Amino acid sequence: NSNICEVCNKWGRLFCCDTCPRSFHEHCHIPSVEANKNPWSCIFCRIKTIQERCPESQSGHQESEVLMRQMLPEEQLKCEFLLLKVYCDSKSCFFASEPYYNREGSQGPQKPMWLNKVKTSLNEQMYTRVEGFVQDMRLIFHNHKEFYREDKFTRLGIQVQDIFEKNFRNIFAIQETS
Ligand SMILES: [Zn+2]
Ligand SMILES: [Zn+2]
Ligand SMILES: [Zn+2]
């Protein structure tokens, strides 16, 4: 196995996947690493199995159809993995925990949102459709853009949203367009 956490790139108390070389901190994996289960397969492995069992799941889809899907187990898993893909970027630190807002010339968002809140909402099965999860995720970046206005710090929201959007298109096999 790997000697660092796949998500945060630090050593520590690591749980090792049995079907690939990745390792994880307990709460870096999503879902949190399962208590028993020998062997244990990580989320990357579980996502790969879905594709292999239904090759046609990789043909192009329309975003509007994807968002209306019910959060059955496979969609739940895909949203977990997309969330994990954002935490994999170090710039996710800025959007992880509950923000606060006191900047001259700006007002905080009406509906604050952050990664750990989305993590909890997945864990607690609070989303009934993919649209719920994607809306909260895009809301994180949109709040940041509006609040920071012309400060160059706005760019951090563009950068992390780009990671989200590329991974969304990959994981849910969105039809490629020009
Ligand atoms: Zn970690
Ligand atoms: Zn694995
Ligand atoms: Zn099939």
- Ligand 1 centroid–CA 3 distance in Å is 11
> What are the sequence ranges of the domains in the chain?
1-59, 60-178
CA-based nearest residue to 84, from 31, 137, 135: 31
- Backbone φ, ψ for residue 40 (5° rounding): -115, 135
Ligand nearest to the backbone CA of 24: 1
Helix (H, G, I), strand (E, B) or coil at 3: coil
Distance CA(62)–CA(178), nearest Å, equals 14
Method: X-ray
Spatial distance between the Cα atoms of 132 and 51, rounded to a whole number of angstroms: 23
Distance 43 CA to ligand 2 centre (A): 6
In the reported structure, the alpha carbon of residue 17 is separated from the centroid of ligand 2 by a whole-number distance in angstroms of 5
Domain 1-59: assigned CATH number: 3.30.40.10
Output the CA torsion 42→47→48→53 (10° steps).
130
Nearby residues of 120 by Cβ (< 8 Å), 6 or more positions away? none
Single-letter code of the amino acid located at 136:
D
Closest ligand to residue 58's CA: 3
Q: Are strands 23-24 and 15-16 parallel, antiparallel or unpaired?
A: antiparallel
What 3-state class would DSSP assign to 27? coil
Ligand nearest to the CA of 47: 2
User: What are the phi and psi torsion angles at 15 (to 5°)?
Assistant: -100, 130
CATH architecture of the domain 60-178 equals: Up-down Bundle (1.20)
